[PDB]
Paper text:
[name] ([name]) is ubiquitously expressed in most cell types and regulates the transcription of various genes involved in a broad spectrum of cellular functions: cell growth, development and stress. Mitogen-activated protein kinases (MAPK) control transcription by phosphorylating TADs. We showed that [name] and p38 bind to the [name] TAD through distinct regions.
We found that an intact Zn-finger partially overlapping with the D-motif is the minimal [name] binding domain of [name]. In addition, we set out to determine the crystal structure of the [name]-[name] complex using the [name](19–58)_Q34R/H47R construct that bound to [name] ~100-fold stronger compared to wild-type. The crystal structure showed that M51, L53, and F55 from the [name] D-motif bind in the hydrophobic pockets, while K48 binds in the negatively charged CD groove. Furthermore, arginine replacements at position 34 and 47 increased binding by creating additional H-bonds at the [name]:Zn-finger interface. The new crystallographic model provides the structure of the biologically relevant [name]-[name] complex. In addition to making extra contacts, the Zn-finger in the [name] TAD contributes to the binding energy by decreasing the entropic cost of binding in the MAPK D-groove. This suggests that the Zn-finger limits the capacity of the partially overlapping D-motif to bind to p38 and favors [name] binding. The Zn-finger+D-motif module is more [name]-specific compared to an NFAT4-type D-motif, and specificity is achieved through both positive and negative factors that promote [name]- and limit p38-binding, respectively.
Author numbering:
A (entry chain A): 3 to 175, 188 to 362
B (entry chain C): 22 to 57
Write the structure that this text describes.
């Protein structure tokens, strides 16, 4: 039938079928999420390993369509050591009437951060990892991209302890790493993301999810029990929300951070470990703060004693990305427009 | 004109400062273990 489909073959992984470029051999399950399986493969042309992620009908609805087009143009134009890089993107379907599936070829990593967070970690690993996220987060903010939803399962690390953030977050508009300012519908700024480094840092020290909220109501309550009800000066955004679930929600005074993260959680091996426990618990104190007025900046967190041991201009001052589309966060189309919009992104 | 050199295979990176190379070599030496 076709010269062009002699360039593809099909491999079955569970119920999923991957129809990929024949350069990609030895496909194998290496992880899964709600969008399906991701595979390890060998690129016979590049003679290296890769990760391959399939998006089945990225334009099924409009919010997914915006998220697919957004993750495509940005991965196309963000080149940073701590951001996952796109190696190729393709579709096996021969035209837009037939266009259905999108395959993203990215670099191959060893695991995600959930598989490290459950582990035991010394200050040198923890601070090195967090420093790496702050470098990735800082690179995104240079170009105007506020992640707003970093989570340990969408960050991958490698056995030499390097780290790459997988996604770019939500388009402008389980909540366990979501900052108060976006779970309560205020405005947000770049340091919205500092809150989420805070929950991951806290997660690494304590050993399990800090604020695992069952609902959208339990997620705010389980924050204030530990951190205490916020200040009257903080009550902004909508006035309906001002009274709502707050003014008489049972008053909470949080616990101290000496009490939230006791020296039990850290190793008091040396004087050096006594000093690093102290510094880290102080860094938390500045990221796990409800009022963003009083929350640290990314640049300040990168110059923090716990974190600035690793400082080097190479990765902390990179050349900012050149996002070709500016309305990217504000485009609003129909499913058919998104489809052709996503298609010619795959096809140029 | 940058005398202090990292010796890692595949890294030709050079440092003008002694301390700055120190953390760079330590960065190559790191590892972590995980469970799927
Ligand atoms: N490039 C990669 N290298 C190594 N492991 C990866 C890679 N991409 C994904 N994984 C693993 O596969 C899982 C699924 O990846 P992910 O891209 O998060 O899919 P997803 O969760 O369904 N979609 P999303 O909602 O964007 O997070 C991740 O949590 C990782 O554990
Ligand atoms: Mg995910
Ligand atoms: Mg995604
Ligand atoms: Zn080196």
């Amino acid at each position: 039938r076709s010269k062009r489909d002699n360039n593809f073959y099909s491999v079955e992984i569970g119920d999923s079928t991957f129809t990929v470029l024949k350069r990609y051999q030895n496909l194998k399950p290496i992880g899964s999420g709600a969008q399906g399986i991701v595979c390890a493969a060998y690129d016979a042309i590049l003679e290296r390993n890769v990760a391959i992620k399939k998006l089945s009908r990225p334009f099924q609805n409009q919010t997914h369509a915006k998220r697919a087009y957004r993750e495509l143009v940005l991965m196309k134009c963000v080149n940073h050591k701590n951001i996952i890089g796109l190696l190729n993107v393709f579709t096996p379907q021969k035209s837009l009437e037939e266009f259905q599936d999108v395959y993203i070829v990215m670099e191959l990593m060893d695991a995600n951060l959930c598989q490290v967070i459950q582990m035991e970690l010394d200050h040198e690993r923890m601070s090195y990892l967090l420093y790496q996220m702050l470098c990735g987060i800082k690179h995104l903010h240079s170009a105007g991209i506020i992640h707003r939803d970093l989570k340990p399962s969408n960050i991958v690390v490698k056995s030499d302890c390097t780290l790459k953030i997988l996604d770019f977050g939500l388009a402008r508009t389980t909540r366990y790493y979501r900052a108060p300012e976006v779970i309560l519908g205020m405005g947000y700024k770049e340091n919205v993301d500092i809150w989420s480094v805070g929950c991951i840092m806290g997660e690494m020290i304590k050993g399990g999810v800090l604020f695992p909220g069952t609902d959208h109501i339990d997620q705010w309550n389980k924050v204030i029990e530990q951190l205490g009800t916020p200040c009257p000066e903080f009550m902004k955004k909508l006035q309906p929300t001002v009274r709502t679930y707050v003014e008489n929600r049972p008053k909470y005074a949080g616990y101290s951070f000496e009490k939230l993260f006791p020296d039990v959680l850290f190793p008091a091996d040396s004087e050096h470990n006594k000093l690093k426990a102290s510094q880290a618990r102080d860094l938390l104190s500045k990221m796990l703060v409800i009022d963003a007025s009083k929350r640290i900046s990314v640049d300040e967190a990168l110059q923090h004693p716990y974190i600035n041991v690793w400082y080097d201009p190479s990765e902390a001052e990179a050349p900012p990305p050149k996002i070709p589309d500016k309305q990217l966060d504000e485009r609003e189309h129909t499913i058919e427009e998104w489809k052709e919009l996503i298609y010619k992104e795959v096809m140029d | 004109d940058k005398p202090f050199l990292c010796t890692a295979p595949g890294c030709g990176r050079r440092f003008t400062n002694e301390d700055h190379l120190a953390v760079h070599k330590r960065k190559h030496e790191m590892t972590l273990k995980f469970g799927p």
